[PDB]
């Protein structure tokens, strides 16, 4: 029953290849799970190296041959637009769900029976999550907790030494842009900027913006305690006539004097700019004056500005000009003819940093910058890439907690406790079917792939860490107390995640469980593998 | 190149069995998924029987016939796509031992199949139950069956109402001994046109009774509505008037161009004054309208719409009452817009509309769909079409057939008993249909996860001794009554399904030779 | 899935030193008959299709242009002798 | 037919952790480890490099080799990038990172064979690194005081030149120290203003002769000849120098400006015009007192005739970098135009003359006891092509290392010749022994890697490591009159080539390493080693 130039898998082979493919993808990405996981290398085929642990990066930048694993990779990657994290978790859950389902299918359990059991477990799992979570204090001033959130996110991605550097940077950068009166926040208010010639441990938080083009005169101020900012769109390069003209001279003296006569047009504009400076804290102590001109500035006029203790920047990018208007509070002057103090903004400490190859201008300490900058440093591409991802991952982790006050103790406490819950509730309720229970049992066991994979990577015995957690949980249940028990991936024994400071996000756990259940079900329900024209 | 004889017969049945197999497990509320690998490297898991058959390449002409068969089913009845393909294939499979091993000539098998169709159609009627296709509430309960687990299920009262008003408007509900019974002729393809307009929400959908134009006018800014409309439908253009001669206008001297413009100005004004004699509110001209003509008519407080084809005016006249005339001097004082509440020129989503609705139903309607995005509008349109399809299928005949495999099982049992009285060579292939019908209740069991023999045997016993309304529970896999578990389907689906399935089998059984050539 | 060379050659170890010696001796063998007032002449056919006949070690080695990366050291040092002294390049 | 499991990504054969990807990656690195292993030390080995363009060079420098190698395998690229880190903001340590990082991986494999995970090994290495970096702070004996004295410079420059060129160390040290002492200002305790760019010292070489006639020029040496009639300036001081970027010929026109001739009189009139305009431009130059003119471009015949009549030395310098460097000698600013070298843009040179170096004539812009240049030029000679080219590199390394003497305690001196490395072995081991649990396994092996330096130094010197190493260890494993070791902080490898036995005191030859170089290498080498160990799989894909 087959047309030429086509192929199909009709018998159970369709399921074996779907499970096998998923098992492959699992066996790769499981090694990236947890702070003790390994680091994957990507080669772009052109000779460039990028290193990452991030599930989304691994799935979206690596090519996959197995058409079934492609479906898992895409569905898991979609989580990036929903939670921003948990991609590796989903792949691990899907793999083990298909492993456990396969074990039962071999016994004659129809894929539908497992699928329905998964849906029953999913609905009860969401109930468990809602009762398992802890409500976070609604105060945004809780820096101590927010550090724990950023730390937990960073430890997954960096070498744990950069965690000490990045943790306060992620925490304060997000809290700084967090709106007052307990409102929402947009983490796009934090600029992610890379620079070279410094070690990755030098990554730093900048209160304001950092500009690329600096001053180009040796007498430009190095640092000004407080300055007014002129936002100017008018070119200060040597101007020529707008109409047909020329320089007609009988002597070298007349030649240059005629050129100077046209140059006076720029000097007149400079006078109005300098006169403004003279009016607004002209000679006041501990004051200065900064120009961030959108257009070019003549080397002649840079000499003028430097002599007047003015820090003159030129050829600013639009993105900097628009942001600097917001940060400094000034307005863009389209014509020097209307120049007045009303144009000026204000900034605090303004200074330039000199790097072997580049200069960077800092416009920090503003009344309300409504923006932060993080400077990600390194000597290599892969070092900058890994650190950049670690910063963006932390910023999303903290922002998600500030938006969603629901926090869940981590270190596997959710997944082990949920597995125990489902096993008990299923027999207490019996609300599915005598055979459907096989799907729920498969689900409850599959949940343990996370605490098992987390510890497998740590190098501790996966069998003891589970038993130890079970022992402590049993004591809590017999004592009629609430106790959150996880695994300490540094010691190997159990721990209370709420003392260690290991937290998961509600959004991540909610969608990771729902997604993995759907993905595994979509593969289990596949009756035939069709191939035509390929 | 060429395949003949039993090799052609086996090839035709084999290919048909393959196509049926492709979607065999895609039937039922618990349909399985199918992984389709695209030549371009992608893949989908769709369980949509239409897409699966569409997106799979076939070689054998017999398989291509089955693909076109499904297209025919879709045009005739809004459902039954997969039932026809599965049944048609199984019939050919059941005819296989008779065509090849028993050496029964195709002409005998085809004749037996035609008789099996006749008997099967009568059985489907016998097991049906009536519905009152005049009771809107009863119809809403049936129509919702096509809306469940769709986005718009939360507004299903509006989706049903639109389907009820649209179908009943076009339904020919008549019976007499003169013209005869139309059998509730319904056309939801052309006479219920659906249009998607940005803005609003699902509940804001409306049904129009009249004509809606999308053509813009000379002055987009017009009174919100006209309470006393008068519409002019005129062919003659409003431009320089020429005679019946072949005389051309040729101007060489620059000063002489004024002679033609001055003549046109007088002639155009006089034509426009004749139009304004009847105090219109909307003037529609089929030919061109000169710039001067647009000003002469507009300045009087009247909308002007130029270059409108006769095919539009013929419909506009039915809902406005305006007479279509050739010459401007043929316009009548009776050209009015009475028997109408108002004409509306409201712009929706920065798009101009002209609503020519009145108090009459010109055997047709148009449905306005509303929504906050194109995605919402598309979901409303697709889901409404399902509501209209099932509304048509039910209002086409006041009868439902029991689902869950019940009807197909009843046909099998009744054909098997009828076979006992059908002495002769035809008795053998006749049974082929009775066995083929089982492919539906068998598939439902296979998806449920039960034993295809033990559960079917229980079903057959229930039909043999009990009622014909016994079927398979989609969720539990148990043999249950379709009275408690309604699962009722419009009879037209079961009648067309067995009709088209057997006819297709009869076609391929007739082909003992496939010959290439141009 | 990765390699280190993609057509990049490197050879290291004592065997390379001996290999360098063997190639360098070959140059000596080309020039050894040119030593002395009764030294023998060598026939070199150049790419320009002209033939050179000489027992002058400097002429011969400059035209030989041994390709081997190590033996070329003998060419360089002979040219140094030819520039600094003007004779003795054979020795 | 043969099935394979685990390979589902574009059909790649990509080894998992259980397949020994780490061990296989290290094996690939070992090929480069051995290549670099024989470079370190005063007796290091040479390598022949055949550039794809048909150029054969010999060098001792591992970094040169690594840049000339086409490195494909990512496991090696990690260490090659680490080498570049030693080149950025540091002038030494290339061999230290390549050799140490390889050995750290080699001993890691010994731990992997035990069943000790890459995570446990990396964690131990990070601890041993932090311990190592702290211990180095206490090994300081002396310190460079940044007085920029010739003798203080020689103390550092000599061991830096060593291991790139051996046997000429004292000659090259004088050449670098002299040139460095020329460009360095006289100052003490001044760290606010940076100075002494590496570019401040140029090296120039001519084929022929030997270093026995090498010298240092207080100024720039150009390979271009005095194109004009005047080949040298007088013995007077402060010759005014004009520098132009515009070619010394008739001015052009931005738009068209093409002259067409139809009549004989027009030819005469335009010819006189151009000659007068050029004279006016050459006259205005001379009228400012200019005695030497430097062009960034060519010179017209008429300009030569007028510049000759004005007695102006005509010297072409086509290199934009040489013109920028000329601003550091005479101070002149290149004129974007022609015929108006404003006096403020004129420079001053005391002497401009032609000199014969190696038989080749060059033009020199210099000063003697006055108006002293901010640039220096080191003059090398040598008849052998391969040797002279490498000597030039030795000069650059000396200058770069001096730059390493930076405000943040760059002057801290530790005993070299492996003495620091040996003491680290003892101290790091004790750190391991005091550390509980599996961490001690990697900390101890971390120490083991550090014996590669006294081993390599012995091997390159022709010494039997099996006698030198236990003698070095016994030399540091001694009884001292107190908790703090004194006399036996200075026992290093004796790079002599002698027969019998023994060790040598750092104090005998003032062999010291810079702390900044050592601590930097310790950071880079560990990061390189732990980076490779963290990679348990390599996957290629379209980006």
UniProtKB/Swiss-Prot annotation, chain A:
Main location: cytoplasm
Coiled coil: none
BP term (GO), one: chaperone mediated protein folding independent of cofactor
Keywords: Acetylation, ATP-binding, Chaperone, Cytoplasm, Nucleotide-binding, Phosphoprotein
Record-linked PROSITE patterns: TCP1_1, TCP1_2, TCP1_3
InterPro entries named in the record: Chap_CCT_zeta (IPR012722), Chaperone_TCP-1 (IPR017998), Chaperonin_TCP-1_CS (IPR002194), Cpn60/GroEL/TCP-1 (IPR002423), GroEL-like_apical_dom_sf (IPR027409), GROEL-like_equatorial_sf (IPR027413), TCP-1-like_intermed_sf (IPR027410)
Modification Phosphoserine, positions: 245
GO cellular component: chaperonin-containing T-complex
GO MF annotations, alphabetized: ATP binding; ATP hydrolysis activity; ATP-dependent protein folding chaperone; unfolded protein binding
Subcellular location: Cytoplasm
SUPFAM superfamilies per the UniProt record, alphabetical: GroEL apical domain-like (SSF52029), GroEL equatorial domain-like (SSF48592), GroEL-intermediate domain like (SSF54849)
Cited function: Molecular chaperone; assists the folding of proteins upon ATP hydrolysis. Known to play a role, in vitro, in the folding of actin and tubulin. In yeast may play a role in mitotic spindle formation.
Family: Belongs to the TCP-1 chaperonin family.
PANTHER family: CHAPERONIN
Subunit structure: Heterooligomeric complex of about 850 to 900 kDa that forms two stacked rings, 12 to 16 nm in diameter.
Name of the protein: T-complex protein 1 subunit zeta
Gene that specifies this protein: CCT6
Curated annotation (Swiss-Prot), chain B:
GO terms under cellular component: chaperonin-containing T-complex
Keywords assigned by UniProt, alphabetized: Acetylation, ATP-binding, Chaperone, Cytoplasm, Disulfide bond, Nucleotide-binding, Phosphoprotein
Gene3D superfamilies, alphabetized: GroEL, GroEL-like equatorial domain, TCP-1-like chaperonin intermediate domain
InterPro entries: Chap_CCT_gamma, Chaperone_TCP-1, Chaperonin_TCP-1_CS, Cpn60/GroEL/TCP-1, GroEL-like_apical_dom_sf, GROEL-like_equatorial_sf, TCP-1-like_intermed_sf, TCP-1_chaperonin
The UniProt record lists the keyword Acetylation: yes
GO biological process, one term: chaperone mediated protein folding independent of cofactor
Subcellular localization(s) per the UniProt record: Cytoplasm
Classification via CDD domains: TCP1_gamma (cd03337)
Keyword Isomerase: no
Modified-residue entries (Phosphoserine), positions: 245
Molecular function terms from GO: ATP binding; ATP hydrolysis activity; ATP-dependent protein folding chaperone; unfolded protein binding
Disulfides per UniProt: 359-365
Subunit comment: Heterooligomeric complex of about 850 to 900 kDa that forms two stacked rings, 12 to 16 nm in diameter.
Function as written in the Swiss-Prot or TrEMBL entry: Molecular chaperone; assists the folding of proteins upon ATP hydrolysis. Known to play a role, in vitro, in the folding of actin and tubulin. In yeast may play a role in mitotic spindle formation.
Family statement: Belongs to the TCP-1 chaperonin family.
Protein name: T-complex protein 1 subunit gamma
Species lineage: Eukaryota, Fungi, Dikarya, Ascomycota, Saccharomycotina
Curated annotation (Swiss-Prot), chain C:
Source organism, top-level taxon: Eukaryota
Subcellular location per the Swiss-Prot or TrEMBL entry: Cytoplasm
Ranges in coiled-coil conformation: none
Biological function: Molecular chaperone; assists the folding of proteins upon ATP hydrolysis. Known to play a role, in vitro, in the folding of actin and tubulin. In yeast may play a role in mitotic spindle formation.
Description of how the protein assembles with itself and partners: Heterooligomeric complex of about 850 to 900 kDa that forms two stacked rings, 12 to 16 nm in diameter.
Similarity remark: Belongs to the TCP-1 chaperonin family.
The protein, known as: T-complex protein 1 subunit eta
The species this protein was found in: Saccharomyces cerevisiae (strain ATCC 204508 / S288c) (Baker's yeast)
Classification of source organism: Eukaryota, Fungi, Dikarya, Ascomycota, Saccharomycotina
UniProtKB/Swiss-Prot annotation, chain D:
Covalent cross-link Glycyl lysine isopeptide (Lys-Gly) (interchain with G-Cter in ubiquitin), where: 9
Domain of life (superkingdom): Eukaryota
Signal peptide (residue range): none
Main subcellular location: cytoplasm
GO cellular component term of the entry, any: cytoplasm
Residue numbers carrying Phosphoserine: 499
GO biological process: chaperone mediated protein folding independent of cofactor; protein folding
Family matches, as Pfam families: Cpn60_TCP1
Subcellular locations according to the entry: Cytoplasm
Self-association state and partner proteins as the record states: Heterooligomeric complex of about 850 to 900 kDa that forms two stacked rings, 12 to 16 nm in diameter.
Role noted for this protein: Molecular chaperone; assists the folding of proteins upon ATP hydrolysis. Known to play a role, in vitro, in the folding of actin and tubulin. In yeast may play a role in mitotic spindle formation.
Family statement: Belongs to the TCP-1 chaperonin family.
NCBIfam families assigned to the protein according to its UniProt record, in alphabetical order: chap_CCT_theta
Protein name: T-complex protein 1 subunit theta
Organism: Saccharomyces cerevisiae (strain ATCC 204508 / S288c) (Baker's yeast)
Organism taxonomic ancestry: Eukaryota, Fungi, Dikarya, Ascomycota, Saccharomycotina
Encoding gene per record: CCT8
């Amino acid at each position: 029953l087959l047309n030429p130039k086509a192929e199909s898998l009709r018998r159970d082979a369709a399921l074996k290849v779907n499970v096998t493919s998923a098992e492959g993808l699992q066996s790769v990405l499981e090694t990236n799970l947890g702070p003790k996981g390994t680091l994957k290398m990507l080669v772009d085929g052109a000779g460039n190296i990028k290193l990452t642990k991030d599930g989304k990066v691994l799935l979206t930048e690596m090519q996959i041959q197995s058409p079934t694993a492609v479906l898992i990779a895409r569905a898991a990657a979609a989580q990036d637009e929903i939670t921003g994290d948990g991609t590796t978790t989903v792949v691990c859950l899907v793999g083990e769900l298909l492993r456990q389902a396969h074990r039962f299918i071999q016994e004659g359990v129809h894929p539908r029976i497992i699928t329905d059991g998964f849906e029953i477990a999913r609905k009860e799992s969401m109930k468990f999550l809602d009762e398992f979570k802890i409500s976070k204090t609604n105060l945004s001033n809780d820096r101590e907790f927010l550090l724990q959130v950023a730390r937990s996110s960073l430890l997954t991605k960096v070498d744990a030494d950069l965690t000490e550097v990045l943790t306060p940077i992620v925490t304060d950068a997000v809290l700084s842009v967090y709106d007052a009166q307990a409102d929402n926040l947009d983490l796009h208010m934090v600029e992610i900027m890379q620079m070279q010639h410094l070690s990755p441990k030098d990554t730093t938080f900048i209160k304001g913006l950092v500009l690329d083009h600096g001053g180009r005169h040796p007498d430009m101020p190095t640092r000004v305690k407080n300055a007014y900012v002129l936002i100017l769109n008018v070119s200060l390069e040597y101007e020529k006539t707008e109409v047909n003209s020329g320089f007609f001279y009988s002597s070298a003296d007349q030649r240059d004097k005629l050129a100077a006569s046209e140059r006076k047009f720029v000097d007149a504009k400079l006078k109005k700019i300098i006169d403004l400076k003279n009016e607004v804290c002209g000679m006041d102590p501990d004051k200065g004056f900064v120009i961030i001109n959108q257009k070019g500035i003549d080397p002649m006029s840079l000499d003028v500005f430097a002599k007047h203790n003015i820090l003159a920047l030129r050829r600013a990018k639009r993105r900097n000009m628009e942001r600097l208007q917001l940060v400094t509070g000034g307005e863009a002057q389209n014509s020097v003819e209307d120049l007045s103090p009303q144009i000026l903004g204000f900034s605090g400490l303004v200074y330039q940093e000199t790097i072997g190859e580049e200069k960077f201008t800092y416009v920090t300490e503003n009344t309300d910058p409504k923006s932060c900058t993080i400077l990600i440093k390194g000597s290599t591409h892969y070092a900058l890439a890994q650190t950049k991802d670690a910063v963006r991952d932390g910023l999303r982790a903290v922002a998600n907690v500030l938006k969603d006050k629901n926090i869940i103790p981590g270190a596997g406490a959710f997944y082990i406790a949920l597995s125990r819950y489902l096993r008990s509730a299923n027999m207490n309720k019996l609300g599915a079917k005598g055979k459907t229970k096989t799907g729920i049992e498969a689900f409850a066991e599959a949940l343990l792939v996370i605490p098992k994979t987390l510890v497998k990577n740590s190098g501790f015995d996966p069998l003891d860490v589970l038993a130890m957690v079970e022992d402590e949980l049993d004591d809590a249940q017999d004592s009629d107390e609430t106790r959150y028990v996880g695994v300490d991936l540094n010691i190997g024994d159990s721990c209370d995640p709420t003392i260690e400071g290991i937290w998961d996000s509600y959004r991540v756990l909610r969608n990771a469980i729902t997604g993995a259940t759907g993905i595994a079900s979509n593969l289990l329900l596949c009756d035939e593998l069709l191939r035509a024209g390929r | 190149e060429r395949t003949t004889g039993r090799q052609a017969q086996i090839s035709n049945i084999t290919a048909a069995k393959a196509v049926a197999d492709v979607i065999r497990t895609c039937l039922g509320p618990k349909a399985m998924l199918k992984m389709l690998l695209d030549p371009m490297g992608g893949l989908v898991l769709t369980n949509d029987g239409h897409a699966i058959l569409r997106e799979i390449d076939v070689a054998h002409p017999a398989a291509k016939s089955m693909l076109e068969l499904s297209r025919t089913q879709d045009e005739e009845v809004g459902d039954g796509t997969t039932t026809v393909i599965i049944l048609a294939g199984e019939i050919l499979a059941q005819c296989a031992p008779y065509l090849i091993e028993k050496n029964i000539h195709p002409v005998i098998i085809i004749q037996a199949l035609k008789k099996a169709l006749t008997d099967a159609l009568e059985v489907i009627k016998q097991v049906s139950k009536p519905v009152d296709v005049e009771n809107d509430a009863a119809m809403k309960k049936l129509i919702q069956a096509s809306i469940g687990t769709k986005y718009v299920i939360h507004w299903s009262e509006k989706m049903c109402e639109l389907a009820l008003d649209a179908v009943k408007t076009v339904r020919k509900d008549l019976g007499q001994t003169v013209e005869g019974e139309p059998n509730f002729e319904i056309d939801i393809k052309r006479y219920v046109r659906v249009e998607k307009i940005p803005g609003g929400d699902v509940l804001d959908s409306r049904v129009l009774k009249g004509v809606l134009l999308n053509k813009d006018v000379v002055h987009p800014k017009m009174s919100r509505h006209i309470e006393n409309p008068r519409v002019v439908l005129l062919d003659c253009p409003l431009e320089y008037k020429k005679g019946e001669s072949q005389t051309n206008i040729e101007i060489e001297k620059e000063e002489d161009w004024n002679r033609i413009l001055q003549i046109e100005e007088e002639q155009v004004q006089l034509m426009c004054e004749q139009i304004l004699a009847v105090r219109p509110t909307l003037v529609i001209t089929e030919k061109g309208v000169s710039d001067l003509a647009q000003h002469y008519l507009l300045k009087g407080g009247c909308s002007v719409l130029r270059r409108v084809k006769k095919s539009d005016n013929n419909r506009i006249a039915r809902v406005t009452g305006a007479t279509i005339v050739n010459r401007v001097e043929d316009l009548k004082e009776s050209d009015v817009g009475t028997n109408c509440g108002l004409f509306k020129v409201e712009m929706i989503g920065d798009e101009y509309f002209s609503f020519l609705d009145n108090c009459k139903e010109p055997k047709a309607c148009t449905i306005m769909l509303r929504g906050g995005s194109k995605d919402i509008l598309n979901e409303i349109d697709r889901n409404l079409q399902d509501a209209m399809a099932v509304a048509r299928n039910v209002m086409l005949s006041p009868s439902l057939s029991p689902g869950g495999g019940a009807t197909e099982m009843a046909v099998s049992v009744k054909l098997a008993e009828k076979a006992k009285q059908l002495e002769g060579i035809q008795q053998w292939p006749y049974q082929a249909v009775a066995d083929a019908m089982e492919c539906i209740p068998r598939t439902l069991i296979q998806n449920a996860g039960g034993d295809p023999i033990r559960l079917l045997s229980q079903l057959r016993a229930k039909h043999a001794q009990g009622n014909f309304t016994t079927g398979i529970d989609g969720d539990k896999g148990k043999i249950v009554d379709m009275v408690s578990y309604g699962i009722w389907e419009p009879e037209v689906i079961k009648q067309q399904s067995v009709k088209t399935a057997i006819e297709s089998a009869c076609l391929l059984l007739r082909v003992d030779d496939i010959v290439s050539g141009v | 899935i990765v390699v280190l060379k993609e057509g990049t050659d490197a050879s290291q170890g004592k065997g390379q030193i001996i290999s360098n010696i063997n190639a360098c001796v070959a140059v000596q063998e080309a020039l050894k008959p040119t030593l002395g007032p009764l030294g023998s002449d060598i026939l070199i056919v150049t790419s320009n299709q002209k033939t050179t006949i000489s027992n002058d070690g400097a002429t011969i080695l400059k035209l030989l242009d041994v390709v081997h990366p190590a033996a070329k050291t003998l060419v360089d040092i002979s040219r140094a002798q030819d520039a600094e002294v003007g004779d003795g390049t054979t020795s | 037919q043969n099935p394979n499991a685990g390979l589902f990504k574009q059909g790649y054969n990509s080894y998992s952790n259980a397949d020994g990807q780490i061990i296989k990656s290290i094996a690939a690195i070992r090929e480069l480890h051995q290549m670099c292993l024989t470079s370190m030390g005063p007796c290091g080995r040479n390598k022949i490099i055949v550039n794809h363009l048909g150029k054969i060079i010999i060098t001792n420098d591992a970094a040169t080799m690594l840049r000339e190698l086409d490195i494909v395998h990512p496991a090696v690229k990690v260490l090659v990038m680490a080498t570049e880190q030693q080149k950025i903001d540091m002038g030494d340590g290339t061999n230290l990172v390549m050799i140490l990082a390889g050995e750290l991986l080699n001993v890691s494999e010994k731990l992997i064979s035990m069943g000790l995970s890459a995570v446990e090994i990396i964690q131990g290495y990070n601890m041993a690194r932090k311990f190592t970096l702290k211990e180095l702070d206490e090994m300081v004996v002396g310190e460079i005081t940044d007085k920029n004295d010739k003798n203080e410079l020689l103390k550092m420059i000599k061991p830096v030149i060593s291991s790139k060129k051996y046997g000429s160390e004292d000659i090259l040290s004088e050449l670098v120290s002299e040139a460095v002492s020329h460009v360095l200002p006289v100052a003490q305790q001044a760290g606010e203003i940076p100075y002494f760019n590496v570019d401040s010292i140029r090296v120039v070489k001519i084929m022929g002769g030997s270093l026995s006639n090498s010298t240092v020029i207080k100024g720039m040496v150009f390979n271009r000849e005095p194109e004009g009639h005047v080949k040298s300036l007088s013995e007077d001081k402060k010759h005014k120098v004009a520098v132009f970027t515009c070619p010394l010929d008739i001015a052009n026109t931005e738009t068209k400006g093409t002259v067409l001739l139809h009549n004989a009189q027009e030819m005469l009139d335009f010819s006189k015009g151009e000659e007068k305009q050029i004279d006016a431009m050459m006259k205005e130059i001379a009228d400012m007192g200019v005695e030497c003119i430097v062009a960034g471009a060519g010179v017209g015949e008429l300009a030569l005739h007028y510049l000759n009549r004005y007695g102006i030395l005509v010297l072409k310098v086509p290199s934009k970098f040489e013109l920028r460097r000329l601003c550091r000698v005479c101070g002149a600013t290149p004129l974007p135009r022609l015929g108006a070298p404003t006096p403020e843009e004129l420079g001053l040179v005391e002497t401009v003359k032609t000199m014969e170096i190696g038989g080749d004539r060059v033009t020199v812009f210099k000063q003697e006891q006055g108006e002293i240049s901010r640039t220096s030029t080191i003059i090398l000679r040598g008849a052998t092509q391969n040797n002279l080219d490498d000597i030039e590199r030795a000069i650059d390394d000396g200058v770069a290392a001096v730059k390493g003497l930076m405000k943040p305690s760059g002057g801290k001196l530790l005993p070299g010749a492996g003495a620091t490395e040996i003491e680290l072995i003892s101290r790091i081991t004790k750190y391991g022994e005091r550390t509980p649990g599996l961490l001690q396994l990697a900390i101890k092996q971390f120490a083991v890697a550090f014996e590669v330096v006294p081993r390599t130094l012995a091997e390159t010197a022709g010494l039997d490591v099996n006698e030198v190493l236990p003698n070095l260890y016994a030399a540091h494993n001694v009884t001292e009159p107190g908790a703090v070791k004194t006399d036996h902080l200075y026992k290093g490898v004796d790079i002599d080539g002698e027969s019998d036995e023994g060790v040598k005191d750092i104090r005998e030859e003032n062999i010291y390493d810079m702390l900044a170089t050592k601590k930097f290498a310790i950071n880079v080498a560990t990061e390189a080693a732990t980076t490779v160990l963290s990679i348990d799989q390599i996957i290629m894909a379209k980006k």
